[PDB]
Each structure stands twice: as structure tokens, then as C-alpha cells.
């Protein structure tokens, strides 16, 4: 897969993880 | 000058660069961090004892096909689970 | 060139080369003798004067400033030192 789209998916996963951590704390 | 300090009083800078660059070595990093003593299942030991939990039948990698007939063990000294493969032929029945 | 004399090269080469590129660094400029029309008022000026130098007793401009050699007045006399 293209590095740009992989990076975009990484940013989406980072946002999801940050939201999960914020809702947990 | 090969991109490195060469003055007679740049020994500190050279030593700092050497210390920073040495961390890239696998042996250097492993020796100082002690990952063998905390992360490795054997804890830096050449040999380790355990007890057999159950058998396992993992398949083969590229170009070949065989059932290796391995065994899972639990280390007493660490408490972790380990996969091991018997070296000789036809000893799975011998192992209980 | 395998062999060439850097001790006493040709005067033409030393003249065509830049001032700082010769054997001995020296100014290629020179001073001037100027005579004002009417009254002599002999005095020495410099080639690239960079100023509108006038006579010490007259309002006539000895030379005008320019980027290169300063342009001298048409009526003023020109003499090498």
C-alpha cells in the first residue's frame, strides 16, 4: 500500500486511540 | 576533515559522538539494557528447566512440509510459557 | 605548462592580470595633475576621486564622481604624474 494512505490510516488510528484514552481517563 | 573533530582538545566531543553512536550495535544495547536478563525467557541462562503443558503441531515454512511435533512448556523460575522442538526423531511418544 | 617563469613574466601579462593576481600587489590607479581654466591653481587629484572636488579658490569642479575613474572637467588640463 502507498505510504501516504498508510500514514493517513495511522493518523486515524492515533485519533481513535487518543479518544479511547481520553474517555478512559 | 572527514566530518569529524580533529583538534587536540576535541576528545570530549569525539567521546560523546562515540557513546551516542555505539547504541546502534545490537550487542552493546543488549548488554547495557539487560534485555536478556529481563525480556528473554531464559533470563540470560544457557539452560532452563520447565514442565510440559501440551503438545503442538506447527507447520513448516517455505519450500517444505512436515509436522515438527513440538511441545509447550512452562518455566518454573520465570513462570512464562515457552515453545520447544525435540531435536531427535520419534521422541514425542517418549515425552509425556 | 610544464615550465614557465613566475619570477619575471611578461609585462603584458602582468598588465592584463588583476591587481591582486600579480607577483607584488600594487594599485593600478594613479594621481593626476589638473590645471583650471583662467587661473592655474595646480593641484593633485586621484583617478577615482569619488567626490566632486573643486578648486581651492574657485567654484569650478575639478572632476565628477563615477563608479570607475572619476570624469574630469573638459576645460581642465590632464597630466600624468
Amino acid at each position: 500500500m502507498r505510504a501516504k494512505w498508510r500514514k493517513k490510516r495511522t493518523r486515524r488510528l492515533k485519533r481513535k486511540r487518543r479518544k479511547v484514552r481520553a474517555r478512559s481517563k | 576533515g572527514k566530518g569529524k573533530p580533529r583538534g587536540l582538545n576535541s576528545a570530549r566531543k569525539l567521546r560523546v559522538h562515540r557513546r551516542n553512536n555505539r547504541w546502534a550495535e545490537n550487542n552493546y544495547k543488549k548488554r547495557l539494557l539487560g534485555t536478556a536478563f529481563k525480556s528473554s525467557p531464559f533470563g540470560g541462562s544457557s539452560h532452563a528447566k520447565g514442565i510440559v503443558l501440551e503438545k503442538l503441531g506447527i507447520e513448516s515454512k517455505q519450500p517444505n512440509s512436515a509436522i515438527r511435533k513440538c511441545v509447550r512448556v512452562q518455566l518454573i523460575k520465570n513462570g512464562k510459557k515457552v515453545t520447544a522442538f525435540v531435536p531427535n526423531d520419534g521422541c514425542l511418544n517418549f515425552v509425556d | 605548462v610544464l615550465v614557465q617563469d613566475l619570477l619575471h613574466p611578461t609585462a603584458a601579462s602582468e598588465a592584463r592580470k588583476h591587481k591582486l593576481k600579480t607577483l607584488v600587489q600594487g594599485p593600478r590607479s594613479y594621481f593626476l595633475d589638473v590645471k583650471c581654466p583662467g587661473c592655474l591653481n595646480i593641484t593633485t587629484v586621484f583617478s577615482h576621486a569619488q567626490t566632486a572636488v573643486t578648486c581651492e579658490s574657485c567654484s569650478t569642479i575639478l572632476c565628477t564622481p563615477t563608479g570607475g575613474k572619476a570624469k574630469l572637467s573638459e576645460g581642465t588640463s590632464f597630466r600624468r604624474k
Partner: protein, 87 residues
Amino acid sequence: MENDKGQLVELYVPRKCSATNRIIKADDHASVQINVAKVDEEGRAIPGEYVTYALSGYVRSRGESDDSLNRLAQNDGLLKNVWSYSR
């Protein structure tokens, strides 16, 4: 090359180029040996009395061999005036 005994040791005594004192290699394949015959008061060149100039291949590769030959001839008297030190 000499030893304590005084006898000659090592073979292949090498030559050096006249223009530049660099040893000519045996494996070198870009060098020639210029030779000029000498006349004796009659315009006729006496055989076997030629003078020899050694020219390495490096000066040839740099294209300075002609100037080197003119200098050598002028210095040896084979030539009179084409070569000037001042240049």
C-alpha cells in the same frame, strides 16, 4: 639496488622520462622514445649518432609533450629559439 657484498642485485634497471623524472613502467603502453640524428657539416645525418629523448605517457596524456620536446631540443642545442622560459 646494492647489497653489502657489492654485487649488483635486482634486474630491470629502469629509465626515466626526460621532461619529468618519473620512472617509465614496463606495462606502460603510451610512451615513445624520440631520437634525433646528427649532421656533420654537410647536411647528411651520420647513422648511429642519434640523441635520445625519453617521453613518458603521462605528459602525452596531458598534451604537453610537444612543449617538453621543444624545451629539450633548445636546451641541448638541437633548437635555437621557439621555446621561451618567460612564455
